[PDB]
Amino acid sequence: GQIQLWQFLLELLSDSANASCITWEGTNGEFKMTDPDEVARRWGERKSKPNMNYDKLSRALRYYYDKNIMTKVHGKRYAYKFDFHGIAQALQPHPT
DNA sequence: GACCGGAAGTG
DNA sequence: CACTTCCGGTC
């Protein structure tokens, strides 16, 4: 609850215990979803939204492209790359 | 079945 | 605004 998808993914990636569903892989920023159904299952669970799937989660990721929060790793399947430009901005404080 | 982005809905 | 839902492209 309250939590951004970009934050949720950093959360999982920060602990190598979650390697079986998501893990850093490649250049600075690059990660891949080893089990995207499980990643999406947890994201629905977190948001109380049990019809969540990879196809919906990924549309969320795709919206991050214009926001410069992340970008697709072309050719690698389930792999994306966080972009510091937009994360820095997203990390800044906001009213509540 | 990715992956894409348009379009419409949500609180 | 930051997603969720849905769906018709294209590979």
Curated annotation (Swiss-Prot):
Gene Ontology biological process terms from the UniProt entry: animal organ morphogenesis; blood circulation; cell differentiation; hemostasis; megakaryocyte development; positive regulation of DNA-templated transcription; regulation of transcription by RNA polymerase II
Keyword Transcription regulation included in the entry's annotation: yes
Record has Signal as a keyword: no
Part of the whole protein covered: 279 to 374 of 452
Name this polypeptide is given: Friend leukemia integration 1 transcription factor
DNA-binding region: 3-83
Further comment: Located on a fragment of chromosome 11 flanked on the centromeric side by the acute lymphoblastic leukemia-associated t(4;11)(q21;q23) translocation breakpoint and on the telomeric side by the Ewing- and neuroepithelioma-associated t(11;22) (q24;q12) breakpoint.
GO molecular function per UniProt: chromatin binding; DNA binding; DNA-binding transcription activator activity, RNA polymerase II-specific; DNA-binding transcription factor activity; DNA-binding transcription factor activity, RNA polymerase II-specific; RNA polymerase II cis-regulatory region sequence-specific DNA binding; sequence-specific double-stranded DNA binding; transcription cis-regulatory region binding
Cellular compartment(s): Nucleus
Family the entry assigns: Belongs to the ETS family.
TM region positions: none
Gene Ontology CC annotations of this record: chromatin; cytosol; nuclear body; nucleoplasm; nucleus
Disease: Ewing sarcoma: A highly malignant, metastatic, primitive small round cell tumor of bone and soft tissue that affects children and adolescents. It belongs to the Ewing sarcoma family of tumors, a group of morphologically heterogeneous neoplasms that share the same cytogenetic features. They are considered neural tumors derived from cells of the neural crest. Ewing sarcoma represents the less differentiated form of the tumors.
Location, primary (coarse class): nucleus
Quaternary state and interactors: Can form homodimers or heterodimers with ETV6/TEL1.
Result of altering residue 59 to Q: In BDPLT21; loss of function in positive regulation of DNA-templated transcription; decreased localization to nucleus; no effect on protein abundance
Function comment: Sequence-specific transcriptional activator. Recognizes the DNA sequence 5'-C[CA]GGAAGT-3'.
Keywords on record: Activator, Chromosomal rearrangement, Disease variant, DNA-binding, Nucleus, Phosphoprotein, Proto-oncogene, Transcription, Transcription regulation
Superkingdom classification of source: Eukaryota
